[PDB]
Amino acid sequence: MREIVHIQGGQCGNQIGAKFWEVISDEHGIDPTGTYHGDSDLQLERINVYYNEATGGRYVPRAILMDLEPGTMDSVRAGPFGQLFRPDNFVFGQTGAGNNWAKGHYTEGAELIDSVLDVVRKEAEGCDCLQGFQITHSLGGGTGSGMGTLLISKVREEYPDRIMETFSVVPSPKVSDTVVEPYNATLSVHQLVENADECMVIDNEALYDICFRTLKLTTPTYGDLNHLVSAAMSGVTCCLRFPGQLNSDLRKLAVNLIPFPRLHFFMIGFAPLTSRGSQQYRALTVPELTQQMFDAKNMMCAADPRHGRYLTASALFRGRMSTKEVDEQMLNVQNKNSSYFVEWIPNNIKSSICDIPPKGLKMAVTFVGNSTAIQEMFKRVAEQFTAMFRRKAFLHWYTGEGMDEMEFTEAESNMNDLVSEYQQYQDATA
Amino acid sequence: MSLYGVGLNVQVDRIKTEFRLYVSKQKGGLNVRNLRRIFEQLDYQQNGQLNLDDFKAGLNKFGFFLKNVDYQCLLKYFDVEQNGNVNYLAFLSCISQTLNQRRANFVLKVFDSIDSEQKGAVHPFSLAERLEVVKNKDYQIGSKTREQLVGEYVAQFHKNQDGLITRDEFVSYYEDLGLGISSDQHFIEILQTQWGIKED
Amino acid sequence: MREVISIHVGQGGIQVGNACWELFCLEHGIQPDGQMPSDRDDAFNTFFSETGAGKHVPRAVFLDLEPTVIDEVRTGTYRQLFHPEQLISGKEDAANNFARGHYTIGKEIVDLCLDRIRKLADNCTGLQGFLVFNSVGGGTGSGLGSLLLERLSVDYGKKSKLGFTIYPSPQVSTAVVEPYNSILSTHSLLEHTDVAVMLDNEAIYDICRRNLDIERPTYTNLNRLIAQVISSLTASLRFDGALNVDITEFQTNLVPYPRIHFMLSSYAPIISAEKAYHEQLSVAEITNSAFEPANMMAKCDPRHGKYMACSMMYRGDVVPKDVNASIATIKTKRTIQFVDWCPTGFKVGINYQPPTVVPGGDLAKVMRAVCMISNSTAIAEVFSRLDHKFDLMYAKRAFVHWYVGEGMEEGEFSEAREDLAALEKDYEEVGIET
Amino acid sequence: MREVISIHVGQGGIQVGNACWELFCLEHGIQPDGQMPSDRTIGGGDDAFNTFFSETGAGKHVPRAVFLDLEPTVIDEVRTGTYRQLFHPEQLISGKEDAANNFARGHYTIGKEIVDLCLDRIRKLADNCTGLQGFLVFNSVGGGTGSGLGSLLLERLSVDYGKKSKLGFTIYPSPQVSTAVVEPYNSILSTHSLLEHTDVAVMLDNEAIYDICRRNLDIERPTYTNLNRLIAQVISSLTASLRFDGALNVDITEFQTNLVPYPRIHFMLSSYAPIISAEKAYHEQLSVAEITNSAFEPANMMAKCDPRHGKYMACSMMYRGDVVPKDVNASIATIKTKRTIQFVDWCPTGFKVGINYQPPTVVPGGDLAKVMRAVCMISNSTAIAEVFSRLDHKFDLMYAKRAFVHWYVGEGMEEGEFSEAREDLAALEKDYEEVGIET
Amino acid sequence: FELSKGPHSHKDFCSTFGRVSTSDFRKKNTGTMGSNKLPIIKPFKYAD
Amino acid sequence: QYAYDFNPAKTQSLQSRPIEHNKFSAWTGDQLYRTSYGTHWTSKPQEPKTHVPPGYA
Amino acid sequence: MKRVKESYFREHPHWSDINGCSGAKEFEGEDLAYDARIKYQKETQKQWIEQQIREKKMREEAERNEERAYA
Amino acid sequence: MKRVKESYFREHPHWSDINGCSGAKEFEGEDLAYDARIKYQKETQKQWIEQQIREKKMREEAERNEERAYA
Numbered sequence A: 001m002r003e004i005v006h007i008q009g010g011q012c013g014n015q016i017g018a019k020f021w022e023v024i025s026d027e028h029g030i031d032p033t034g035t036y037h038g039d040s041d042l043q044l045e046r047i048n049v050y051y052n053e054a055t056g057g058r059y060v061p062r063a064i065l066m067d068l069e070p071g072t073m074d075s076v077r078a079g080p081f082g083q084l085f086r087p088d089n090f091v092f093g094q095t096g097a098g099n100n101w102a103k104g105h106y107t108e109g110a111e112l113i114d115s116v117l118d119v120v121r122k123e124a125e126g127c128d129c130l131q132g133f134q135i136t137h138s139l140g141g142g143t144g145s146g147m148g149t150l151l152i153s154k155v156r157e158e159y160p161d162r163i164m165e166t167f168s169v170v171p172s173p174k175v176s177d178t179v180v181e182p183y184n185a186t187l188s189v190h191q192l193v194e195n196a197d198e199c200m201v202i203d204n205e206a207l208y209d210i211c212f213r214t215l216k217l218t219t220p221t222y223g224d225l226n227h228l229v230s231a232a233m234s235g236v237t238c239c240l241r242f243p244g245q246l247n248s249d250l251r252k253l254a255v256n257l258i259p260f261p262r263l264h265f266f267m268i269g270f271a272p273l274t275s276r277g278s279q280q281y282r283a284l285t286v287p288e289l290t291q292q293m294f295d296a297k298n299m300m301c302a303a304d305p306r307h308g309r310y311l312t313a314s315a316l317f318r319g320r321m322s323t324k325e326v327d328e329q330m331l332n333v334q335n336k337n338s339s340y341f342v343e344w345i346p347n348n349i350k351s352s353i354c355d356i357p358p359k360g361l362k363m364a365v366t367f368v369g370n371s372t373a374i375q376e377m378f379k380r381v382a383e384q385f386t387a388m389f390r391r392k393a394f395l396h397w398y399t400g401e402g403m404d405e406m407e408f409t410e411a412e413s414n415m416n417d418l419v420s421e422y423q424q425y426q427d428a429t430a
Numbered sequence B: 001m002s003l004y005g006v007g008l009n010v011q012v013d014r015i016k017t018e019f020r021l022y023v024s025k026q027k028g029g030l031n032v033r034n035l036r037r038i039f040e041q042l043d044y045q046q047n048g049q050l051n052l053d054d055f056k057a058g059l060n061k062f063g064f065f066l067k068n069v070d071y072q073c074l075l076k077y078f079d080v081e082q083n084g085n086v087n088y089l090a091f092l093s094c095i096s097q098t099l100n101q102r103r104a105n106f107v108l109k110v111f112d113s114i115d116s117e118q119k120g121a122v123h124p125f126s127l128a129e130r131l132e133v134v135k136n137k138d139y140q141i142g143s144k145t146r147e148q149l150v151g152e153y154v155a156q157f158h159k160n161q162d163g164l165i166t167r168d169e170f171v172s173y174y175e176d177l178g179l180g181i182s183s184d185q186h187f188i189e190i191l192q193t194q195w196g197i198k199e200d
Numbered sequence C: 001m002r003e004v005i006s007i008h009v010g011q012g013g014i015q016v017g018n019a020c021w022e023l024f025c026l027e028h029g030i031q032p033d034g035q036m037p038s039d040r041d042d043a044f045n046t047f048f049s050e051t052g053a054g055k056h057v058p059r060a061v062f063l064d065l066e067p068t069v070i071d072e073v074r075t076g077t078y079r080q081l082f083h084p085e086q087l088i089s090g091k092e093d094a095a096n097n098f099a100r101g102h103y104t105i106g107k108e109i110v111d112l113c114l115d116r117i118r119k120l121a122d123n124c125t126g127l128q129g130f131l132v133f134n135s136v137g138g139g140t141g142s143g144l145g146s147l148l149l150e151r152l153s154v155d156y157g158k159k160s161k162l163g164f165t166i167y168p169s170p171q172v173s174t175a176v177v178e179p180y181n182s183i184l185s186t187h188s189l190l191e192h193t194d195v196a197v198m199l200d201n202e203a204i205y206d207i208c209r210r211n212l213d214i215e216r217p218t219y220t221n222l223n224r225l226i227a228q229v230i231s232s233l234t235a236s237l238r239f240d241g242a243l244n245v246d247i248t249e250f251q252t253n254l255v256p257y258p259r260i261h262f263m264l265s266s267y268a269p270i271i272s273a274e275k276a277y278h279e280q281l282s283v284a285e286i287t288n289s290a291f292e293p294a295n296m297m298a299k300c301d302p303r304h305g306k307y308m309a310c311s312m313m314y315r316g317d318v319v320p321k322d323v324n325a326s327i328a329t330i331k332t333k334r335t336i337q338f339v340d341w342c343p344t345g346f347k348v349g350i351n352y353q354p355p356t357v358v359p360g361g362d363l364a365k366v367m368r369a370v371c372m373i374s375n376s377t378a379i380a381e382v383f384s385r386l387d388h389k390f391d392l393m394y395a396k397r398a399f400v401h402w403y404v405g406e407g408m409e410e411g412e413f414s415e416a417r418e419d420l421a422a423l424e425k426d427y428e429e430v431g432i433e434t
Numbered sequence D: 001m002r003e004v005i006s007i008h009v010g011q012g013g014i015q016v017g018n019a020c021w022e023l024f025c026l027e028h029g030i031q032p033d034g035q036m037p038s039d040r041t042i043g044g045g046d047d048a049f050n051t052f053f054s055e056t057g058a059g060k061h062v063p064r065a066v067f068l069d070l071e072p073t074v075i076d077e078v079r080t081g082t083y084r085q086l087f088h089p090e091q092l093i094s095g096k097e098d099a100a101n102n103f104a105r106g107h108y109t110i111g112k113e114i115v116d117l118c119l120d121r122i123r124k125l126a127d128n129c130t131g132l133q134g135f136l137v138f139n140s141v142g143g144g145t146g147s148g149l150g151s152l153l154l155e156r157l158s159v160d161y162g163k164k165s166k167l168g169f170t171i172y173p174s175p176q177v178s179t180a181v182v183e184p185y186n187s188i189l190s191t192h193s194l195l196e197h198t199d200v201a202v203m204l205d206n207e208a209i210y211d212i213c214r215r216n217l218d219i220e221r222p223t224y225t226n227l228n229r230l231i232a233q234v235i236s237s238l239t240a241s242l243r244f245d246g247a248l249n250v251d252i253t254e255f256q257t258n259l260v261p262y263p264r265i266h267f268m269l270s271s272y273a274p275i276i277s278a279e280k281a282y283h284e285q286l287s288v289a290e291i292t293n294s295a296f297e298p299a300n301m302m303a304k305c306d307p308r309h310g311k312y313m314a315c316s317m318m319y320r321g322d323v324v325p326k327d328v329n330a331s332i333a334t335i336k337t338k339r340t341i342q343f344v345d346w347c348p349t350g351f352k353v354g355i356n357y358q359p360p361t362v363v364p365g366g367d368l369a370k371v372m373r374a375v376c377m378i379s380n381s382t383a384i385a386e387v388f389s390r391l392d393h394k395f396d397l398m399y400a401k402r403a404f405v406h407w408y409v410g411e412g413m414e415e416g417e418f419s420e421a422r423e424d425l426a427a428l429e430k431d432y433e434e435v436g437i438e439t
Numbered sequence E: 001f002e003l004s005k006g007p008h009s010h011k012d013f014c015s016t017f018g019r020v021s022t023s024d025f026r027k028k029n030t031g032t033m034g035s036n037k038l039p040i041i042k043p044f045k046y047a048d
Numbered sequence F: 001q002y003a004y005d006f007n008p009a010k011t012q013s014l015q016s017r018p019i020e021h022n023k024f025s026a027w028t029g030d031q032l033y034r035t036s037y038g039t040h041w042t043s044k045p046q047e048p049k050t051h052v053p054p055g056y057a
Numbered sequence G, H: 001m002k003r004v005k006e007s008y009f010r011e012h013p014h015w016s017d018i019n020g021c022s023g024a025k026e027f028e029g030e031d032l033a034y035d036a037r038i039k040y041q042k043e044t045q046k047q048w049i050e051q052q053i054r055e056k057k058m059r060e061e062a063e064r065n066e067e068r069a070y071a
């Protein structure tokens, strides 16, 4: 009954998935042994969206973890909440990706995806009414970006009607974490633009900014960064699992956010976020939430949205609140900032309300917005890619698996015309 | 909803006031003192413990209905010994107003006017006589069975071992009646008219 | 012997039905369990039905494609009241898509509702008509709503159908694609609804803020106000009164022509108890407040147009000689002007049952109340505003792939604009003086 | 003084006869041991049980039934259970080797060594009776021994007795759901056999009753016991008028005189009302008007067939409980008023109504609810051509290349039987199309 | 008779156990989610 | 005042919680239980037979 | 077959009850027992509904126990 | 619908109460208790106003305790 299955790949994908399943389990009151210990009934009615059932009343997530090296899944199994996952859901090789898109997409993932496609196929038919898929992977790596995109294409060929949502960690060159990341980044986007229904880009530089300027904590770690993504990940589907004044699912958010099919790249943000030494002075009211929600520095991407026009925005509120202020605040912010919104669509903000706030908080909000300012990261990646590809640097590694430069040429254009067409809507007038 | 921390405390308070309006709205024969009497029947062994199914039956028989998630909230808060049984005695100890100070004046002064012997205990028959006189002008002093026939006006409360009405239970009976009526002026109107004493 | 059947479709229809069916149960004394408390006047026959073995079940059907809101009705305090198989729910939401709820997942569920409707109709003997509730700015609200009314026209025909739609507010709203499914809905319900009432939300926000003294209103507050309008409208069907008016005696006195049946409502007195301690709540004044454009329940100003017909109902302790005096004063004031060809334009009904109050509500208990249903040419402004928003966005063909890809031809919008466009032309031509 | 002999063949016939006989015993107040309970010591009057039972001259009652099979497991289970003291020891005829889903085996090789014993027992049951109304036969048709022995018994009974009535409650295969893979063959052959030897045939496919149990009784995992209970209730409602007082009485002979327009047309489908679970049983009032409206509902047809695709020929409804003829007449008028139900041109009046007073009985551990009113329908319509039409395609697909034909040929059946069976089926199809057209 | 089916349907060739090059790839807009181009318009009647 | 804990309600692992014992037959109170008859009058396995009719096979 | 009850509810009256009925003024078909009979039928139905609900709840619990043991 | 009451305030009179009224001298429309009825209605309205004000104040305090706890 509109349940979604979760599939993740790569080191970044596995680490993010590890923190996400811990967050969801606490929301529904699931112990590390898989036994329900909730206190109300609202925490059990919609538990089948993310959890299966077995003998003894225990629940197992319908998650699938894939990698070309069992090194990453080695650490996740020994951590807390590691016994929740099915042993049969782990699919791995024994060679490795090599930070090479070609290896993860033509010579290693291709021969390995037969087994994982069987696992996801078993999960898809078992559920009552499949609602869609969600993806967590990084575009800067080999097995995540390479084999991940191949699975995206393969799944779409068998379920063309179900929804497909992705969480992509696109590389910001400031964290030059891989010298050959421009090759993988531009090749993954070209594959991603044709199949994925919704995409949500995430940047490590933005996450460092949040942990440093907003939370004001001295020593950030990937544990903290992964939790920020996990908190936003649950917010987009919170209304699907709990009652609310207005109900909204993945399909409803997509329908109200994508004017044209090729324009399906968003940015996400979460609020409230306050430091330990600064929440003594702040007040918890709806105007405060919408003030931090639209702040430029709060976005989880390196793209600054004050250089472009919001094509469309979406907000999902949590907790008990008055509907009037929710509709009033969105109208108020839309009028005072008429230069930051495109003009040929009136009232381009969607609102939804859920009655169950996150544990420990009384109010919350998750922001998903389609802004034309995201073209600036594609421009930066493309210009770096054409600089490296002009001299054919690092090319022999990709060509060694039979990959031809014609595919590289086509990857540039599809990214290029994406930027060109996505820019003229900023200058469009009515 | 989301009764993690103080959510449990605030969720019960909504039920505490929601019960009060329902009892106040009817304004008629429904009294909170019937709840303690109706729960004793289901308790059987005078344990003081009731499970969810029997607790729901008593409330619904009284005419008070809530949601399924609402009933679970009451059980978690009021299960002090963690045995899966709610404490109806603890539940009835709450949601009960103490009585306002001005209401205390009328309750005591009505008692004191009848209690002219200063002993603090009033013969139940004396209440029966004055309650009928204020209702009919042709009652006449003499009656055939003035004790039993007119005694139906009293004995709704309970007496001590001596049979005399203790003042402590005299105010206890009247304070519980002061839940179905939220209009203090109407509480004034009922008491002064039905007892024929008005002074404030 | 006289009954009505209520149709609730969409989240707006169902969530309003929760407020309406709370009032009806308490007004007639029905418990949430369905049993009669009092030992104990067949006034409940209009809305409830005697199912024999004890309880009473309503003559209502709830329709939705998402089971989230329906589960609350099956779990809330009224779980034991409604029949288990009259709460029809799907599996997938229409997702703000008119085409999805009208062409793809409409046929799979519209058959279940028709089967349920027939059984309810066969029970009734003198069925007056149908009442439908739907939110125009939604998927299943506009999608299934059009499909049901289109199908209901040929299934029954001469039976009257009344509608209480919710058009989007001039500027404040929830969805962003709502102009598309709002135009297509009006393009359907024009030729399939006998009487339609505009119930946009922004007007109700102003009323609650101005009168009830509430700084944080919620949809529960709005639904209680709307349920009052329904109760007063149908009060004369079950309670004795000096002047009785039925459902059939509305369109016989309130629609000049079949094409013109769009109306805007009002209600009075709408006052909080704190400031009800000062005003005198006379018959003469509550009808004066009913004509105030700020108190109107739809965001339209009648001062920009003419009144064609005016149906207004009193309940409480009104006296007909007091009503006649008030009508004379209304005709005197110049700022209210009627159309030329309507020398008399008032239909008045009187009921004796005073309005009932919902516990936990905010309206003050009073012995007098009046409900207003007005037909005026000023309602052409809301269509003009909706036309501008639709044409503005449709110029660049946005969001249209999600409508073409569900089997809906692209030519729907062209005819929907033409159908709407002719409507203003008719409304302006009627008001021209001869 | 009026009796009916029940014939049960095959696993389906036996497993439906079990429910039928437990229901009859509980209805007439006979303990499984075969005698009335010892608590009631007032002697005895009644005698209504004489239709189904017979006094043995010392105490207990013996049913007028016979059980038949070639696989002894089910019959051994019958004679091992708590009903071992009720049935006569040697009216439970059992063979040695089952036909194993082979019509030729069950009709030409094995059944001929048991038909003689069966007819001997039938004579021993018939000579005892004096007012024999007819025979009731139950059979699953997609099974080898079932179809074969049913065909052979009907063939031999048609000449042993002649004009005595026979009623067949066959169970044809569902449109898509089935257990075996070869059932179209013997289904067609059995259809040929029973075309010329049955007076009334009732359609009892399994998918329709599965749908009834799922939608109405709210049972997510039904089993054959529920199916048998429903069929037993149908049989009881059909035969109730023969053994209880009523305001309007109908005999067995008053089915083939008011439901059979022509001798060739005797295939008809049934329905029952009300079938409602106790959670919502009498949270709807279940008046006579609505129960007779639900009796006409296409989804409640006990055969998977929609009457909207054809015209009605005749109707036969039996009410039991506290119904009233004036309410029945009002309901009939309303049904005639409704337009989605239409009758054939040459049948201006098409209803025969019978009223019985004994309310339906309830079996412990059942699913239905205790009701004071009930209606059972037997309707004949042109829509019955659907099951023949869809069954035709299945046979041709696997017969165009002689699949499984060697199994049937090697058992002594001529190869030419298939073509003539198909020709008779096609001729049967043409009859229903020609009758329904307007003049 | 027909029962036209929409989004999900219930029949597939190899849904359960289907599984038994570098030159070919997705070129520009063969994907479902791309290709911002729309078909031609028809008059429609709606009068029926 | 204290950090974040994982296990709620203090549920000890079945690994160390007592030991195995002869309850392997916990479900098999009805495992040789027949339902062709059965589920018709009784819910328990049938008692051993003592009498049989002729032709019991 | 038999027709011994003129209706399911009331049987044939004693011969002393029909003192007149030669002139058609007393018909005995006007009930005068309709309302109370219907009312009583209501509770007689409700008791059966309660009994069946309790029985099915017991059956469901018995069904659950065996799965709990198999675990 | 029906009209069983002449007005909302007074019901139909007893048949012996209308002794004359053949000649138009009594009409029962002159009231003569109008002022007292209005005076009593004033207090009946005031009681409801006070009750609802008390209920609203209690609700407001219950709402304030919410923030008081969350802080």
Ligand SMILES: Nc1nc2c(ncn2[C@@H]2O[C@H](COP(=O)(O)OP(=O)(O)OP(=O)(O)O)[C@@H](O)[C@H]2O)c(=O)[nH]1
Residues within 6 Å of the ligand: A246, A247, C009, C010, C011, C012, C015, C016, C065, C066, C093, C094, C095, C096, C097, C135, C136, C137, C138, C139, C140, C141, C142, C166, C173, C174, C175, C201, C219, C220, C222, C223
């Ligand atoms: N006045 C009022 N309007 C409501 C209420 N609930 C929903 N709405 C209206 O409904 C519109 C959005 O549609 P939804 O209620 O979310 O659901 P829907 O109309 O059934 O459409 P779907 O989401 O596709 O199911 C909003 O613009 C609201 O105006 C309510 O309680 N009161």
Ligand SMILES: Nc1nc2c(ncn2[C@@H]2O[C@H](COP(=O)(O)OP(=O)(O)OP(=O)(O)O)[C@@H](O)[C@H]2O)c(=O)[nH]1
Residues within 6 Å of the ligand: D009, D010, D011, D012, D013, D015, D016, D071, D098, D099, D100, D101, D102, D140, D141, D142, D143, D144, D145, D146, D147, D171, D178, D179, D180, D206, D224, D227, D228
């Ligand atoms: N409704 C119902 N159908 C049954 C039942 N038992 C068997 N059937 C049907 O009978 C068909 C197979 O024939 P059976 O009766 O089982 O076997 P048979 O008639 O003895 O023939 P053989 O297998 O050769 O011995 C199955 O496809 C079922 O549909 C039953 O108890 N109830």
Ligand SMILES: Nc1nc2c(ncn2[C@@H]2O[C@H](COP(=O)(O)OP(=O)(O)O)[C@@H](O)[C@H]2O)c(=O)[nH]1
Residues within 6 Å of the ligand: A009, A010, A011, A012, A013, A015, A016, A097, A099, A138, A140, A141, A142, A143, A144, A145, A169, A171, A175, A177, A178, A204, A222, A225, A226
């Ligand atoms: N947010 C986040 N990013 C990570 C994490 N681990 C790795 N990354 C990012 O992923 C990139 C490298 O990805 P990689 O490990 O090669 O992916 P793989 O090849 O699929 O395993 C680096 O730029 C990191 O910034 C993590 O736990 N959280």
Ligand SMILES: [Mg+2]
Residues within 6 Å of the ligand: A247, A248, C011, C066, C093
């Ligand atoms: Mg919705």
Ligand SMILES: [Mg+2]
Residues within 6 Å of the ligand: D010, D011, D071, D098, D145
């Ligand atoms: Mg067999």
